């Protein structure tokens, strides 16, 4: 048989890699109060996600 047993357990920086993010998606349709359409860009002056 032939196996692999890489080990770094003398520190926590290794053990910290696996749970790094595990985060889901939360960019959603930023509907605008003009046309209710697939919002395109956020206005840098009003910070509103306008589409049209």
């Amino acid at each position: 048989c032939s196996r692999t047993f890489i080990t770094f357990s003398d520190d926590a920086t290794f053990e910290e890699w696996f749970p790094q993010g595990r985060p889901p998606k939360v960019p959603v349709r930023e509907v605008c109060p003009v046309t209710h359409r697939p919002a395109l860009y956020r206005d840098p002056v009003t910070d509103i996600p306008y589409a049209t």
Binding site: Y41, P44, V45, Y50
Partner: protein, 424 residues
């Protein structure tokens, strides 16, 4: 004002003078006489505009000065810029970097047009601010809207390598090339001293920020040069590679053009290849054409030879038109008849009208009688010669005396050979 292309030898040929039924008119747009040869030219021109078949070849044969090149120019001018008309001589193939076969191959591929249409979503607008910390943001602007964009690794790298500043009208496409299209909208007064050679401040765009840019452009099937190297476009302005590998030329480009035509992104448009004075070609080029005309997407050839039964270059065999019979078999020979007293004077009058020379009827008669004894192009040159001799004479209308003055001043081939009795 004088243009680059002033009146020349065949400038009077403003198209092929035929009817809706290919019937040749006696006096038409540039062309005169040669009814049968001109009707044949119109037939082959319709076969061209059709483009349904490939591997056609017509050979116009006749004495020097009967209008072979004239009919060629008429066909060229009647065939608008839509389809390519590659007019090469019979000696433009004897190259040093290219063999006597790759030259014909490139000439063929150059006579096949392809109209490429490309569509792309484009983002264009004035850059208001670029913040970077790596990640950052970009504020594009246009009279219709102002937006925000978050930048990634590659986007930031390209932005920094382009050195786009505030006010620059940046242009960004999907699969970002990041063409810095225009210069600065504001931040002016640099003209106080100087401007970069690439600076074109022209104002910020209007309308919506995102757009769909449909671009159509007509290239040739010789685009293999556009792939045959790392930086390909450069080799398209000079000689380029000695020869592009067949293993790509004849399979890869053809299959990709077929895929483009199937998807509807491009379409091929065959053209014409006019090889003038093809009698200079060696038997090798003829044996090559023998099979090249058998290919799938070859253009139509138009040859113009003035030689009769003569020796074929590279060999000692005499043949009609000085080219092999195995090649003549695959051609379609038209014959041009010599002009008469009626047609010579007509084309001389057309040539006078070209440069607006007011000639008297006696001068026309005398010039026609001269040209029917020596040569046609000789009398054509005599037109301008007498025009100048009379303009220096403080005249307005060329006359018989001014024509005879030029006749005595400038000799022809016949009288020159006659006067060559001294033998130096």
């Amino acid at each position: 004002v004088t243009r680059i292309e002033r009146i020349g030898a065949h400038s009077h040929i403003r198209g092929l003078g035929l009817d809706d039924a290919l019937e040749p008119r006696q006096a038409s747009q540039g062309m005169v006489g040669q009814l049968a040869a001109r009707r044949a030219a119109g037939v082959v021109l319709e076969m061209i505009r059709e483009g349904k078949i490939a591997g056609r070849a017509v050979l116009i044969a006749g004495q020097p000065g009967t209008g072979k090149t004239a009919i060629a120019m008429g066909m060229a001018q009647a065939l608008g810029p839509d389809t390519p008309f590659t007019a090469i001589a019979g000696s433009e193939i004897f190259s040093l970097e290219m063999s006597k076969t790759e030259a014909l191959t490139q000439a063929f591929r150059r006579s096949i047009g392809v109209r490429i249409k490309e569509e792309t979503e484009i983002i264009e607008g004035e850059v208001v601010e670029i913040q970077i910390d790596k990640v950052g943001k970009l504020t594009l602007k246009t009279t219709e809207m102002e937006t925000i964009y978050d930048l990634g690794t590659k986007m930031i790298e390209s932005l920094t390598k382009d050195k786009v500043q505030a006010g620059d009208v940046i242009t960004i496409d999907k699969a970002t090339g990041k063409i810095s299209k225009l210069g600065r909208s504001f931040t002016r007064a640099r003209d106080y001293d100087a401007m970069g050679s690439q600076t074109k401040f022209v104002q910020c765009p209007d309308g919506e920020l995102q757009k769909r840019k449909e671009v159509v452009h007509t290239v040739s099937l010789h685009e293999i040069d556009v792939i045959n190297s790392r930086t390909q476009g450069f080799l398209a302005l000079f000689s380029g590679d000695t020869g592009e590998i067949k293993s790509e030329v004849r399979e890869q480009i053809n299959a990709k053009v077929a895929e483009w035509r199937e998807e509807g992104k491009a379409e091929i448009i065959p053209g014409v290849l006019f090889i003038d004075e093809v009698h200079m070609l060696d038997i090798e080029s003829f044996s090559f054409l023998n099979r090249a005309l058998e290919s799938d997407m070859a253009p139509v050839l138009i040859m113009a030879t003035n030689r009769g039964i003569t020796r074929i270059r590279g060999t000692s065999y005499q043949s009609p038109h000085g080219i092999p019979i195995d090649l003549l078999d695959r051609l379609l020979i038209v014959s041009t008849t010599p002009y008469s007293e009626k047609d010579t004077k007509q084309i001389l009058r057309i040539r006078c009208e070209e440069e607006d020379v007011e000639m008297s009827e006696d001068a026309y008669t005398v010039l026609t009688r001269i040209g029917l004894e020596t040569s046609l192009r000789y009398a054509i040159q005599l037109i301008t010669a007498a025009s100048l001799v009379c303009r220096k004479r403080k005249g307005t209308e060329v006359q018989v005396d001014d024509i005879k003055r030029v006749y005595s001043l400038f000799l022809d081939e016949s009288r020159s050979t006659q006067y060559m009795k001294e033998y130096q």
